[PDB]
């Protein structure tokens, strides 16, 4: 139940970068759980609150 | 875990006869013809569950 403290292991995070137009193909898609993510710069919560 | 199949799905045995070449908007797409409705769907998108 407790909040984790040590850095947890995570699924690999493939970054789809969808544009105006693109040719989606699904050969060699991974079967393991995976994090689809559309944007590059998602480390957006920078401003720390002591 | 084995995800249960959803209420709307139709069971369909795979067979080489189901899949074929076809014209669809100037491309030779790999159409699948649904055995019940008989309808051909060239695109992987929009096929019946």
């Amino acid at each position: 139940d407790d909040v984790g403290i040590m850095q947890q292991k995570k699924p690999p995070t493939v970054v789809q970068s969808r544009t105006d137009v693109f040719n989606e193909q699904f050969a060699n898609e991974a079967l393991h759980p995976t994090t689809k993510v559309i944007f590059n710069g998602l480390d957006v919560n920078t401003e720390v609150q002591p | 875990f084995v995800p249960d199949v959803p209420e709307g799905y139709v069971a369909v045995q795979y067979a080489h006869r189901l899949f074929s070449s076809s014209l669809a908007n100037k491309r030779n797409r790999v159409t699948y013809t649904h055995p019940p409705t008989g309808m051909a769907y060239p695109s992987p998108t929009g096929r019946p569950h």
């Binding site: 137009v21 | 669809a24 908007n25 100037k26 491309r27 695109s43 998108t45």
Partner: protein
């Protein structure tokens, strides 16, 4: 009489051409700055810009 209106301090030929310019500057064909986009995931068989 020349003082009653500045006429924006432009010559009469300038105002006359100017009205034609105003016809030019509102023609729908020139208005190729477009406003707003629809985002929608969708196969692009048979494209047409319209």
């Amino acid at each position: 009489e020349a003082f009653r209106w500045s006429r924006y301090f432009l010559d009469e030929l300038q105002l006359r051409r100017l009205s034609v310019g105003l016809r030019l500057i509102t023609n729908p064909r020139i208005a190729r700055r477009f406003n707003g986009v629809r985002i929608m995931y969708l196969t692009d068989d048979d494209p047409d810009p319209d």
